Ligand binder design. Structure first.
Ligand SMILES: [Fe+3]
Ligand SMILES: [Fe+3]
Ligand SMILES: [Fe+3]
Ligand SMILES: [Fe+3]
Lengths: 82, 491, 305, 102, 491, 305, 102, 82
């Protein structure tokens, strides 16, 4: 059920390997990524974290799971604020 | 009396003949020779512009070494290791590890030309090139060797290339691509022309300026002497390029140069960039990394490239933007993940240094400065766990260096991906992806360190497992903050 | 966890030597990382062209040993000490050239000797260059840096001999401008019967791509033949024709040649730690000896005509 | 790219000499052997970048005079750490030069 | 093959023969040879213990210079002149001026032995000695030459011995006495044994330690290399002394040693003493002058003298007292009269330095410290006129150095005078007077600088007239306080 | 007052050269302070023994010039460059010795040649040492450092020749142990007629204490005779007796000898700026030539016996 | 004169080696070639004073081994800045020693 | 009338050339010497300066002139306090 992706967090300097779960929501994925970013290289802020395919115009719904999203493992995503 | 070299030099390189007992192609196979179908007779017009001869070589090279070694001997007690800023010692560790055994590898590139180039002058100059790189490899093992007894990280002057440490893999992926992994003509263009008249001046002369400012004359004297050899054997590239152009292979030549320059750039950005703008003590920064780039690559190298009749690379504008940006991110990452390096990176963000950075790179503080603010706050609050990573960075499938972008106020990061033969690759730039696409058979089945981690080749699949996989043999060998965070006392 | 360890007095790989590591040990040993990973010699796609080349022509050689790196140049030469020795030898050769030219040595050789030199001596630049090219191939393919180092120096020595030959060809032409000196060497190498055995030998040798076969053919068969069938007969002919410079020059070149034989023999001794290697080496010698023998016969026939 | 354009559009040629006993003699030689050219010198301590427009010649005879001891042209290699321009070298001099004018 | 030196060395020195066409005494006149009537045959037992041969010499000496020059070249930009304490620069000025042309003079002492010694081994080793001193003279002109363009005082590396400046006269009076002014045997004993195994270690190795502490490796490397030659040719002295003793001339030998050691001592006390305890920055004082004396002269030289079968000098106890006292007064005087020197003496009496002095020389403050108190008070009150002399010091008729004693609480000063041939002489010690009396014809009509001043030879007879007489050609050339009195800011 | 002056680019004494001072100029010129004060060469009593010696044998020489210091070694050698040149020459001679010994050269000389060497060659160590002693005397007495420097190097060169002779005497004795090689040279020098003209010449020359006469007798009369009457006849005899080493060795020694002649001639040219000096120099040559001529005749008579 | 007496009454012999590549190898050689002697070393940075009681031998074979490169005994002169003791030198070794015992 | 002597002043470090006059008193000579010593290298003090031949036990009377003293020129004297 382990699902590796590569994630870029808004205002960070890099892309990182973050292993999420096949059944995680786009709210949870955003948490697992943030853990490796906010308060490390990125200042914390108000707002709702969202997930999208890299540089996509389309945001995934917050409730949608990765399995339901159609993402393939090792694909690249961004975590951004509304 | 003796007769002047000009009177007999032509005979030293009158060595081409028409094979009869094997075919020309058997004797000079295209995979090793890279003659591109150009007939033997056309290669005889090759004229090395920086000539020497065997008796002159042994005499002159004898004198070069006598000085290099004499200086090292006379300065053993100068307290460089003991009194130098640790950022400077890490600069030495990085240099010797990243370079010594790659120099020895360069012998093979020169050897490839000495056996397989159809140009007689090239085969002779390549023979001196083999000798030169032998010199360079031996110097750069001999010099750091005395420091083994002081610091296990100096072991990496020898160990690095034998390891799977990420920077060593990035070095080997590059050198195996441009030096040891291709035909003689590709070596002439990618190594002797592109890398050796292009980039090495940055590390062997730009860094020497910083070394002299830091009062490390053993090192400055060493690397500047080494570059005098480079200046001679690098001149094998230009005449090969001229010959290709004259024989209808300009497009092929341009492509090789374009590829080699970008490949060298990304490696220099991760190793020399941080050295020049962060590890080197501020008072010893003769010029910024960008400034040296503009002197050596733009002002000197590119102008020479145009003079020979080639064009600015298609990615010119991307390259210029990259010079402003890339190494700042590479530095940040090398430091955050310092534990995977064999040197101790210095953060180099004291208020005084951040002012210098802002002056050299307007807008720095509103970008990278934003991440350093967070890092600094944590340090001042002893939240050290937030100053060490708990995952791996995503890595470029070409350069083998993590995927980065511009942080802070105007965040922007882009990965350039590619599906190919049922596999998904990720590249850190448009150019890196383009390089892969120029020669997929060279790269397609290579797996970067993180590919290996995900594929089960790194056991256990943990940060510790990865560190062991990278060849670290004791705790002391892994990178740490150069000043043990003492810099925070200035913030 | 990791473990804590103190600094070592030398490289981790030399740290278990009884002796203090020498300059040679420090700068020469175990530098080929390309032998670390049998599937991927070079840090690229495992099936890249050069990776396939190395897996076939190095890794798959029938000449086998589990520790080639243990090989030691019996002379333990490094770049620094090689240059000291050869500057010594070249300064000596330059002194000889200068003083013999002062004394007009070339004018006092036996009548017709210039023609013998034009035919049998000057085209040696082709043969020596072949040795140079071939030495470089063994360098790039050998499975240990200590081996490759001996090959690098031998490649240089080959160019040294080539250069002597070029210099003397031109100089001789100053006294004898009507013998084709510096003019007809390529045609001689290509068409003259005396040269054809040697040319066939080298063209074929240069296409032996297995590192083991390349080494054996070059250093155990070709090079010893050149010593016994070319260098020494030339010294004898020079003696008979009042050429007193050539024997002295050849003596200096032979010092190089004996050095190549010394390290070659030492590599054989290392290889023979594996008893399988005897038949392998012996087989390659038997394979190339006939070509070598025919090359010498033709050359000697030409020389003594 | 104005900065980069300007940097690229130069015709500077000449030796980069590493720190040592050849620095001052090479500067003096560049001045003497290229009269009516302005010689520029950039001092980076570990090396010095010496240049003229389009072409810069160093003769062995002049370098020997400025150096103050017997000198063969081939020895310059001991201290010629780099150079701008294409190079044309012989027993009597070295010439740094460009074919094109930018 | 080659045959080992031991197999053929004897033939290199089988060169004595029985003269037939001139007499032995015509060929080896006693005034030039100094054989003391010892027959030619006895001199053949002379066995130089530190041998070399011509082919070895040119090869080894080639290597010695390559290193010396290479180091100088590699460190040109180390900012020694610009960043060094001016006390250290004055140390360089003093050394080069007092030494370079005296080294060249030493060639003549060696030449005197090469022509006039009856011992064949001595004549050959003296030939290498001639070459060595040529080396030394040329090195020590070549090295300071680059500094001419910075400071006219460096002109004195060449000019000193051509001048009548008081220290130059003291140097010449000594070197002309022990080197150029006597027979070959006297040279062997006074120069090669006494001065060259005795004292030069102080200036060429003791000072080198200080130079390395001060980070001046060009200089430390230079002088230590020079001393490797000294160590070889100085070994001509011991065998001559052994031969004299074996042939009934021990008393004569002892006298020559006794004289040369005292003469060298007074010169070293005025030049090296102040350098080591005052000009050299405190943090760079490897050991005190006395400490180095106890290492080199007492611990090493005197012990060697006893081993060869000679006795401690009759003036032993006076010499030991002098080591405690003399150079402190010499320093004080060289500084007060700084304007007659060609270097800028440093006072070296900051509180921190006076504590070091008290520790190295208990009682210092109650003696010399008393005079420095007065000088210091004047400086702090801008009474600068009291910090410059308005008369000449009285000068020793042997050493040519002013007559001094112990100042302060237990004041004690003694002049040792002598009437001789209707003239009154004054000496600074019992030993200096004794030296004069050993060989009056050598000295009796010499006039010291002050004798000349009083006799009307210095016109005008004023301080200015004297300064002009001493050869000062501009205002800049005359000595000043090294730090322009900035040290007073520490008092 | 004094005046203020800025730093000079070189020594005050060289500051008015048009040219940039060379290494030679910087380290060689005007170093004899002993010529500054005519009454007191040395800083001692004006009538001290050495002061009287110098006033008589240097200052009072009939050979006169008002600026001896202006003299320039035409080779402009300094210690550093002399050693580079001579290490080159000695390394070459060592190479010759080693290779000729390898080839057993000494065994193949003409029968009896060992006796000719024992008699006419090996006692040269005495003659060369006399040149060495005499060269050192001119060094210490010459009125300019640039002159003395040429003498220092010539003294060294003399010991170089002495050393060659010692080495070869011993080596030859290894092949011919029954010819008195290395055993009877002193007796030959002292008693053999062929050597007596040379011994008388040198004993007398070594007692010419005027610096000018010493130089002229040594460098203008004795040394040229040795070249023409000793070195070259030996080369011819060696040729006739299948000694091929000796001519090569002598060629290297002659390079030294021509160098001594070069600077000597240049000193003469300087001196001749004073027209008075012609008769002075000519007079000394006429004085010593007879002894020199008799020395050569006796030696040649011995050699060709 | 107690201090001076004690200083004079020593039997220390051995090389003084100038700063450079011979320092450590000579110390190691002194230890190896004089077993059962205590080797003393005084470090003055520009030179090192190495000593043993009565006699101290350095063999060419051992020095070559500790130095790590081919070495002829005569080369020691390049770095032998001084020495205590009388000296006995040949192609195979150097011996520093005293005749007397103080 | 110029009369050179060499003078050593109590508590100074050296002997200096001081030119006095043939008719100076031993009070005046002491002054001319002091000028080159006191307040330069020697602290000033109460007391009467006196003159004596070097290291002599005999002091010259204060009123006596150098001419009357029998001193010869270039002879050495000390200046000391009673
Ligand atoms: Fe290189
Ligand atoms: Fe290179
Ligand atoms: Fe000296
Ligand atoms: Fe000396």
């Amino acid at each position: 059920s382990a699902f590796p992706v590569h994630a870029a967090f808004e205002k960070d300097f890099l892309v990182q390997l973050v292993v999420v779960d096949l059944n995680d929501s786009m709210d949870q994925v955003a948490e697992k990524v943030a853990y490796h970013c906010v308060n490390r290289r990125v200042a914390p802020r108000e707002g709702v974290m969202r997930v999208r395919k890299h540089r996509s115009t389309e945001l995934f719904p917050r409730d949608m799971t990765i399995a339901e999203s159609g993402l393939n493992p090792t694909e690249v995503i961004d975590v951004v604020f509304e | 009396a003796m007769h002047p070299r000009k009177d007999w030099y032509e005979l030293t390189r009158a060595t081409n003949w028409t094979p009869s007992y094997v075919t020309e192609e058997q004797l000079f196979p295209e995979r090793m020779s890279g003659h591109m179908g150009i007939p033997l007779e056309k290669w005889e017009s090759y004229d090395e512009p920086y000539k020497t001869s065997y008796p002159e070589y042994v005499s002159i090279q004898r004198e070069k070494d006598a000085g290099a070694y004499s200086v090292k001997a006379a300065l053993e007690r100068a307290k460089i290791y003991e009194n130098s800023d640790p950022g400077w010692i890490s600069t030495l560790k990085s240099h010797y590890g990243a370079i010594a055994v790659g120099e020895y590898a360069a012998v093979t590139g020169e050897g490839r030309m000495a056996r397989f180039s159809k140009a007689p002058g090239n085969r002779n100059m390549a023979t001196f090139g083999m000798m030169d790189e032998l010199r360079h490899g031996q110097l750069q093992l001999f010099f750091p060797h005395e420091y083994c007894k002081k610091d296990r990280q100096f072991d990496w002057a020898w160990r690095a290339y034998h390891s799977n440490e990420w920077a060593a893999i990035a070095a080997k992926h590059f050198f195996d691509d441009i030096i040891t992994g291709r035909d003689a003509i590709s070596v002439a263009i990618m190594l002797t022309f592109s890398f050796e008249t292009g980039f090495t001046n940055m590390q062997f002369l730009g860094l020497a300026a910083d070394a002299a400012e830091a009062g490390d004359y053993t090192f400055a004297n060493l690397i500047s002497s080494i570059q005098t050899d480079e200046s001679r054997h690098a001149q094998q590239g230009g005449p090969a390029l001229q010959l290709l152009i004259e024989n209808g292979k300009r497009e092929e030549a341009q492509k090789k140069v374009d590829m080699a320059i970008w490949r060298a750039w990304r490696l220099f950005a991760v190793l020399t960039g941080p050295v020049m703008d962060y590890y080197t003590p501020l008072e010893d920064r003769s010029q910024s990394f960008k400034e040296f780039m503009y002197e050596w690559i733009i002002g000197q190298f590119e102008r020479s490239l145009i003079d020979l009749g080639l064009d600015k690379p298609w990615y010119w504008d991307l390259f210029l933007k990259d010079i402003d940006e890339l190494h700042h991110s590479y530095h940040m990452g090398v430091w955050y993940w310092r534990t995977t390096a064999w040197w101790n990176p210095a953060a180099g963000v004291t208020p005084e240094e951040r002012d210098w950075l802002e002056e050299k790179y307007p807008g720095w503080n509103k970008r990278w400065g934003r991440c350093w603010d967070v890092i600094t706050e944590n340090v001042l609050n002893d939240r050290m766990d937030l100053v060490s990573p708990e995952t791996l960075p995503s890595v470029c499938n070409m350069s083998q260096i993590p995927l980065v972008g511009v942080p802070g106020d105007d965040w922007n990061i882009e990965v350039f991906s590619l599906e190919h033969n049922g596999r998904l690759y990720h590249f850190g730039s448009e150019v890196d992806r383009w390089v892969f696409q120029q020669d997929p058979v060279q790269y397609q089945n290579h797996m970067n360190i993180v590919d290996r981690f995900l594929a089960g080749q790194i056991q256990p699949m943990t940060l510790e497992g990865a560190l062991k996989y990278m060849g670290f043999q004791s705790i002391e060998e892994m990178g740490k903050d150069a000043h043990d965070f003492a810099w925070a006392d200035k913030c | 966890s990791f473990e804590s360890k103190k600094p070592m007095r030398t490289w981790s790989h030399l740290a278990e030597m009884r002796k203090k590591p020498s300059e040679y040990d420090i700068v020469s040993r175990k530098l080929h990382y390309s032998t670390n990973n049998p599937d991927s010699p070079w840090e690229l796609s495992p099936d890249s062209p050069m990776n396939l080349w190395y897996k076939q022509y190095r890794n798959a050689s029938p000449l086998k040993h589990d520790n080639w790196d243990a090989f030691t140049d019996p002379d333990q030469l490094v770049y620094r000490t090689y240059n000291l020795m050869q500057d010594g030898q070249e300064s000596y050769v330059q002194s000889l050239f200068d003083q013999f030219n002062e004394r007009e040595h070339d004018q006092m050789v036996r009548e017709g000797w210039e023609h013998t030199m034009a035919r049998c001596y000057s085209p040696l630049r082709y043969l020596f260059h072949c040795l140079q090219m071939s030495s470089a191939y063994v360098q790039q393919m050998a499975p240990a840096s200590t081996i490759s180092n001996c090959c690098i120096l031998q490649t240089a020595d080959s160019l040294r001999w080539l250069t002597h030959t070029a210099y003397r060809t031109h100089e001789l032409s100053l006294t004898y401008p009507d013998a084709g000196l510096g003019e007809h060497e390529r045609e001689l190498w290509e068409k003259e019967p005396g040269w054809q055995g040697l040319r066939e030998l080298m063209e074929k040798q240069l296409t032996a791509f297995d590192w083991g076969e390349a080494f054996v053919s070059l250093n155990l068969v070709v090079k010893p033949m050149i010593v016994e069938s070319i260098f020494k007969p030339l010294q004898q002919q020079a003696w008979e024709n009042n050429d007193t410079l050539l024997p002295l020059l050849i003596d200096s070149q032979l010092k190089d040649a004996e050095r190549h034989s010394r390290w070659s023999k030492a590599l054989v001794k290392h290889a023979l730690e594996n008893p399988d290697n005897h038949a392998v080496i012996e087989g390659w010698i038997e394979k190339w000896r006939p070509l070598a023998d025919r090359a010498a016969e033709a050359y000697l026939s030409m020389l003594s005509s | 790219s104005t900065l980069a354009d300007q940097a690229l559009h130069n015709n500077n040629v000449g030796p980069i000499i590493r720190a040592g006993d050849l620095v001052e003699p090479v500067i003096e030689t560049a001045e003497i052997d290229n009269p009516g050219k302005e010689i520029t010198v950039e001092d980076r301590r570990a090396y010095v970048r010496i240049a003229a427009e389009g072409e810069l010649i160093l003769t062995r005879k002049t370098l020997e005079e400025q150096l103050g001891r017997p000198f063969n042209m081939q020895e310059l290699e001991i201290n010629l750490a780099s150079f701008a321009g294409q190079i044309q070298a012989d027993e009597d001099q070295i010439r740094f030069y460009f074919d094109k004018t930018m």
